[PDB]
Design a protein around this motif. Structure first.
Motif, PDB file in Angstrom:
ATOM      1  N   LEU A  45       0.825  -1.206   0.000  1.00  0.00           N
ATOM      2  CA  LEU A  45       0.000   0.000   0.000  1.00  0.00           C
ATOM      3  C   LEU A  45       0.864   1.262   0.000  1.00  0.00           C
ATOM      4  O   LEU A  45       0.370   2.364   0.271  1.00  0.00           O
ATOM      5  CB  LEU A  45      -0.926   0.003   1.218  1.00  0.00           C
ATOM      6  CG  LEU A  45      -1.897  -1.182   1.285  1.00  0.00           C
ATOM      7  CD1 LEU A  45      -2.647  -1.133   2.596  1.00  0.00           C
ATOM      8  CD2 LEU A  45      -2.860  -1.148   0.094  1.00  0.00           C
ATOM      9  N   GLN A  46       2.161   1.094  -0.254  1.00  0.00           N
ATOM     10  CA  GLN A  46       3.090   2.233  -0.281  1.00  0.00           C
ATOM     11  C   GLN A  46       3.006   2.964  -1.613  1.00  0.00           C
ATOM     12  O   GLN A  46       2.593   2.387  -2.619  1.00  0.00           O
ATOM     13  CB  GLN A  46       4.529   1.753  -0.137  1.00  0.00           C
ATOM     14  CG  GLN A  46       4.835   0.958   1.122  1.00  0.00           C
ATOM     15  CD  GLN A  46       6.258   0.417   1.104  1.00  0.00           C
ATOM     16  OE1 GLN A  46       7.207   1.160   1.323  1.00  0.00           O
ATOM     17  NE2 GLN A  46       6.412  -0.862   0.808  1.00  0.00           N
ATOM     18  N   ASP A  47       3.431   4.224  -1.626  1.00  0.00           N
ATOM     19  CA  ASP A  47       3.453   4.997  -2.864  1.00  0.00           C
ATOM     20  C   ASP A  47       4.598   4.466  -3.727  1.00  0.00           C
ATOM     21  O   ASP A  47       4.564   4.579  -4.951  1.00  0.00           O
ATOM     22  CB  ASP A  47       3.694   6.478  -2.581  1.00  0.00           C
ATOM     23  CG  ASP A  47       2.429   7.217  -2.195  1.00  0.00           C
ATOM     24  OD1 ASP A  47       1.356   6.583  -2.093  1.00  0.00           O
ATOM     25  OD2 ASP A  47       2.523   8.445  -2.000  1.00  0.00           O
ATOM     26  N   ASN A  48       5.652   3.988  -3.071  1.00  0.00           N
ATOM     27  CA  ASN A  48       6.788   3.425  -3.774  1.00  0.00           C
ATOM     28  C   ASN A  48       6.412   1.982  -4.113  1.00  0.00           C
ATOM     29  O   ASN A  48       6.196   1.158  -3.217  1.00  0.00           O
ATOM     30  CB  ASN A  48       8.033   3.457  -2.897  1.00  0.00           C
ATOM     31  CG  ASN A  48       9.277   3.009  -3.653  1.00  0.00           C
ATOM     32  OD1 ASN A  48       9.331   1.894  -4.171  1.00  0.00           O
ATOM     33  ND2 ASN A  48      10.261   3.895  -3.760  1.00  0.00           N
ATOM     34  N   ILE A  49       6.387   1.662  -5.400  1.00  0.00           N
ATOM     35  CA  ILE A  49       5.978   0.335  -5.838  1.00  0.00           C
ATOM     36  C   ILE A  49       7.041  -0.767  -5.953  1.00  0.00           C
ATOM     37  O   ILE A  49       6.745  -1.859  -6.430  1.00  0.00           O
ATOM     38  CB  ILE A  49       5.163   0.428  -7.162  1.00  0.00           C
ATOM     39  CG1 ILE A  49       6.045   0.933  -8.311  1.00  0.00           C
ATOM     40  CG2 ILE A  49       3.932   1.336  -6.960  1.00  0.00           C
ATOM     41  CD1 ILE A  49       5.393   0.798  -9.666  1.00  0.00           C
ATOM     42  N   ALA A  50       8.247  -0.516  -5.452  1.00  0.00           N
ATOM     43  CA  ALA A  50       9.323  -1.498  -5.518  1.00  0.00           C
ATOM     44  C   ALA A  50       8.937  -2.866  -4.948  1.00  0.00           C
ATOM     45  O   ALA A  50       9.156  -3.888  -5.600  1.00  0.00           O
ATOM     46  CB  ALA A  50      10.556  -0.971  -4.819  1.00  0.00           C
TER      47      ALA A  50
END
Length: 130
Positions: free
Chosen positions: A85-90
């Protein structure tokens, strides 16, 4: 975060998704589009089996991530569902790579079969410079 089309396309290419296990970038774009509308905070509770779908690729808590409240679940990506659910999609990308390493491949997501398979998916990456 709600990604704009070409922004996401360029991000996925940089994360090595183009051609990963034979899956073209346009297929990954079509999948994200139909699964979450390119929204990283998207969640969907499945009342019928008590599982929840998380993030941009809508991965199910019964198999891919741990949320604690899903009965008889496994955590193949070795991640908390919160990571999806993070903005960073790594992390979500690392987990998506894991999903397709199984025999079904991209077919693991039913939405891909309904909206992307055997279709002209070029529109998803056109003009993005990828």
């Amino acid at each position: 975060k709600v990604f704009e089309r070409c922004e996401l396309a360029r991000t996925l290419k940089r994360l090595g998704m183009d051609g990963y296990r034979g899956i073209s970038l346009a297929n990954w774009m079509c999948l994200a589009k139909w699964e979450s509308g390119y929204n990283t905070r998207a969640t969907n509770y499945n009342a019928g089996d008590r599982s929840t779908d998380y993030g941009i690729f809508q991965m199910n808590s019964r198999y891919w991530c741990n949320d604690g409240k899903t009965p008889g679940a496994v955590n193949a990506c070795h991640l908390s569902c919160s990571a999806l659910l993070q903005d960073n999609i790594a992390d979500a990308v690392a987990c998506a790579k894991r999903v397709v390493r199984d025999p079904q491949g991209i077919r693991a997501w039913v939405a891909w079969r309904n909206r992307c398979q055997n279709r002209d998916v070029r529109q998803y990456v056109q003009g993005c410079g990828v």
